[PDB]
From Swiss-Prot, chains A, B:
Flagellin is the subunit protein which polymerizes to form the filaments of bacterial flagella. The chain holds residues 441 to 488 of 488 of the full protein. It comes from the Bacteria. This is B-type flagellin. It is found in: Secreted; Bacterial flagellum. Phosphorylated on tyrosine residue(s). Belongs to the bacterial flagellin family.
């Protein structure tokens, strides 16, 4: 059972940090997407 | 009869101390389980 824990039981002490990192990169990516999806309409309204 | 005593009669001057010691180990084990079963609760409730 101890070997099964070391091979299976997750050491979530770092996996919680990893998943929080993943979700903050998610929010960052969505933020950059939202701010980038405003560039073309702006430059077209500027050149027109 | 004295031979039967020396071979069968418990010299409970030692078995009484053994009973006391075993009761000590039983209570200690109960307390150790009560203390250790709270480790996952604490670590998960505090880390999440």
């Amino acid at each position: 059972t101890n070997a099964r824990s070391r091979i299976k039981d997750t050491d979530f002490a770092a996996e919680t940090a990893a998943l929080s990192k993943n979700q903050v990169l998610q929010q960052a990516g969505t933020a950059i997407l939202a701010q980038a999806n405003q560039l073309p309409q702006a430059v077209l309204s500027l050149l027109r």
